[PDB]
Amino acid sequence: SMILTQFGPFIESISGITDQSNDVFENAAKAFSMFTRSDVYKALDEIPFSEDAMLPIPPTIYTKPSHDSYYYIDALNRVRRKTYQGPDDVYVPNCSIVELLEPHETLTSYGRLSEAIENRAKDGDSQARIATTYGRIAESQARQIKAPLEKFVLALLVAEAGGSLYDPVLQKYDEIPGLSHNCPLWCFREICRHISGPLPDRAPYLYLSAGVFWLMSPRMTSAIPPLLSDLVNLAILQQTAGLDPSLVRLGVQICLHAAASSSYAWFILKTKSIFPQNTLHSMYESLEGGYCPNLEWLEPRSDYKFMYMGAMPLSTKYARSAPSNDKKARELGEKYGLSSVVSELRRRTKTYSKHDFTSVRYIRDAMACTSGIFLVRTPTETVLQEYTQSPEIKVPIPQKDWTGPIGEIRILKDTTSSIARYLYRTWYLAAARMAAQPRTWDPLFQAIMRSQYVTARGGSGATLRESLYAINVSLPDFKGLPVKAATKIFQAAQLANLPFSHTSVAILADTSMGLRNQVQRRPRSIMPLNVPQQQVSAPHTLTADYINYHMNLSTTVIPLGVYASSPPNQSINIDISACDASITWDFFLSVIMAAIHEGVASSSIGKPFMGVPASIVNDESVVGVRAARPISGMQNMIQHLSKLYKRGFSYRVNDSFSPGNDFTHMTTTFPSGSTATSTEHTANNSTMMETFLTVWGPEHTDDPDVLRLMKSLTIQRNYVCQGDDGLMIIDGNTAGKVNSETIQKMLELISKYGEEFGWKYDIAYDGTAEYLKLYFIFGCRIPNLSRHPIVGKERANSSAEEPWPAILDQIMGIFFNGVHDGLQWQRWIRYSWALCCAFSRQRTMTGESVGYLQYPMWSFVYWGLPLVKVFGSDPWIFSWYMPTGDLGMYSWISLIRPLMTRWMVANGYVTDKCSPVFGNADYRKCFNELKLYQGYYMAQLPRNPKKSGRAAPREVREQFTQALSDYLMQNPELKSRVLRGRSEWEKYGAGIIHNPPSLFDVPHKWYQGAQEAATATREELAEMDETLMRARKHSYSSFSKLLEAYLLVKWRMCEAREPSVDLRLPLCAGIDPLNSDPFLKMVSVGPMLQSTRKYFAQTLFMAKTVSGLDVNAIDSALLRLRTLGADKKALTAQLLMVGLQESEADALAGKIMLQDVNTVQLARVVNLAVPDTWMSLDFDTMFKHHVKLLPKDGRHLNTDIPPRMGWLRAILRFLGAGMAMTATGVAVDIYLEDIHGGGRSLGQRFMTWMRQE
């Protein structure tokens, strides 16, 4: 009622009752900024609840002991925590935050970590350092949320106070239960009330952007800020993902038991798999009916092309013959005292016996309820726990099987009984066939190899420059630059003019750390490498790329698992645990470096690689002879890289969360962020699975069934792997599904294969497929809602976060992750309304002058949030598969344009001047009043702007850019061809675009790419404020040239496309006849069915699509110079500024003058793009067959296009398909009505805009 007194018009404005207007938008936004936490906590007291949300809370959360017994000091003064229950108990305790605290100076009830304890810890006291470690890690756990916490639940109450809505297609009220029913708001309300108590201030903590302020209640524990994020996550999902009460109540019970435990994040780790194991891993186990897709492989088994050959029914034979799950899951529930939850989940799972929509929705509802916090620990725990792992090799390579040394490499013998000879054979032949290619000695290929690894995310030369000072080489420091010294670009410009022998001992330096938190996992510790170490590992990446692209070729996502999950085709999921740590010099890296150093010997015998000269090392490879043998370039790089692989890696660890912790220690783990990590892991996974199936399997079996199975399986036909993991497809034979006992015996034989040479296969076999963390059962896609939380964002550093226009940038990503998942749009997109309205006003704090900021609603619709009612239209009228930007804006205003023009004369805005789009009305007095024009151009304004540019002196700036040009370009044929292309382009083609994509942009581009993370403080933020104020105070007179160019054309929709797939088939979780728009659109157009990573690769015209610069911009520049005139030498020179041999550039320019471009590629002249919401759906057949020109009424003479400038057909394809997809309901065949100007006038206006881009 109290909320209703101020939000009367707005709650009904977004619920489809009245239309959305700028007036209630701005009044509501005034209200959205005007709040207090007491004003939010009147609300949750105000709403009465129906007791189905009520359940007991144990009292052991609020009383938790002191934290002094949990931490101790190592013998090297390392602060590490004491483990009580297993070595995985290394996380944040849940206890006693009120005592190490000092109150704020004007917020007398909120407080902060004490300054005295910080000073005594900077002295070096024991207990002070322990206390500040616990305090800072509690702050870092409490920080991991996007916006402040109450703002989300406020937007929840504003959106969801409207009650149940009216579905326009289904013509009924939805039975999403009201806000008075849900468990998590009740638990949130009661925990906040009991934590406040007698205090007048009611919030448990306050979120400033740097760190949080607490509340001085003696019953406060540190488990509360992740718990409230989980509880508001379950409350925000239940309203809009169509949950039941019961699974939400079970998830809330598990969160309460998580707070009751001795450590919150540790329990969330150890119970991360109760919900999949009882429902998804144990599904149906006896069935009688359903429908499943009948996919069929297209015979070349490297191309990954598919065919949907219809639906097919099910029978009793296709019941789950996977082994049991009862004893292990009951033990897992029994060990932690969660037996009621696992018994309830199993009782409800055993009911279902028919594969249809409701069972898949139940699986999605059970997967959605796992906790969505980010697990966090101090970085010293990460480094001292996960890096101490090391592989055990039960059958090593015997010491007789190696020859003597060649330099510091021994060769594996030919007469070797070990299994490593197949790895040696594979990597030998791969190295020889790599080095025999004439592609590898292309200087453009060398230049793109050097351009590959010097990325902006490059760090840790932080002891390299000290070690290079320790070997007495003179490095320029470039004093006077606004670069930071840590970037890899600055480091490569240091190492530009130095011989390889001087930087040879630069290889054995260390590396610092980079931390990334993950959903329900241990925190990922990414790590860089320095410049000579990433240079010297070039055969190690080239040979693995040749494996993954030419020899074994597993794969460089969804329809693969839709095939592999189809019920006659079982699948085995293969995960390799600790796959970085389990490759060392003991087995792998020894035989890898031996095979590469031996395989590259022939075809590169004397010639050197980039920068690295030839050398000589002596050999003793035959026992009788000893000599010195000349060494080529790539062999020499293997010689230098082998020292580093033998020694192991030291890591320079510095955390900000605990003072006094500073250490290095050696490790043998493979580095995560190298230039050859994922390709190397795929290559080794593929090679070991191959030599498994072809040798080691048949050597250790007696069963003809298992032997007959392993003869038919091969990695070329039945095994797909990415990174470390993958699945293995088992085809269904003639008699049905393959017998599960033989598959079980082969599985327990794969585990014995792994325990020989170091690996530890994590193998799950349950009749489902996991692949790149996407879970598919019976050919049905299931989104993991718990993987994408709405509330939390990953923060690793303790540095303060971004300014205002980025927290509003992230929410379009929130809405799009809602789009990719299956949500009831009736309350989800209305929640997106209330939230994005709530984030719109800011209250800047500039000196003595009061200024306010607000984006209009039309900006939010320009970014991709489709409207509910426009100007007297039907409620719930638009779809969220609309394009973002001008194409979208055009389409949904064109769907309503007559009714919108007729609404213009309601409250009459009448003008004599008759326009072809509007006629009776004027649009200025309407649209500049409603800030549609201002919101259109204000959405067009760039977010997160910054420019430091701290007065670079010209001499040392020029020396930095010249050294960067010298490092990127060594070979002067590249310089000659790019100066030749520049000169010919300024001769012929310059003038029409005045903006070239050139290679000399890249030294400048990397120069400012160093200062893309300078985060200067005040002046450009105030400059952003001034630009937004002047762009608000303006009054435009029209749209842009693109949209006014679009407004001339018209279309017409009818005759309602035939269905692509069956309607009864469950294809995706969360779309069904209950979710009318996305499921109905899915059945209309059909799903993707293509690999869609080779489709976009076929689109781009570049010979390998590798430049280091924006290949979309090169293809756009070539097409824009094609369509406007511009004699062929302009295109030759434009290609030569990217750099070619002057001949293939000329040939490709003469080609691109003439051939017909594909439809999707011609977006580049007009800067369109397919939205990512259309990636799940098919589009290509809709473009080729369901948006066509030359309508059913015949010619209209505003339908003809000349044979010259026929690209307008392909852009009108995008136009009609956007007009199809913006409408709710099915996709509809649309033909081309009048365009009012002709192809002449449309081509002239398009060329007129393409004069100035």
């Binding site: 050597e699 250790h700 079996t701 007696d702 069963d703 003809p704 014995k752």
Partner: protein, 49 residues
């Protein structure tokens, strides 16, 4: 099962995980072979009692 036990003993005597010289699962169909057991007596009946 006696051929199975001999195959396992051959595997333990060659100290592999699988006996290379195997006595069971051969190509010869030998579904009529019978080694003596305690089921049948000397007269020709069963030994349930």
């Amino acid at each position: 099962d006696e051929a199975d036990d001999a195959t396992k003993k051959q595997a333990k005597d060659t100290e592999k995980a699988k006996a290379q010289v195997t006595y069971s699962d051969t190509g010869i169909n030998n579904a009529n072979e019978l080694s003596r057991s305690g089921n049948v007596d000397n007269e020709g009946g069963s030994n349930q009692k």
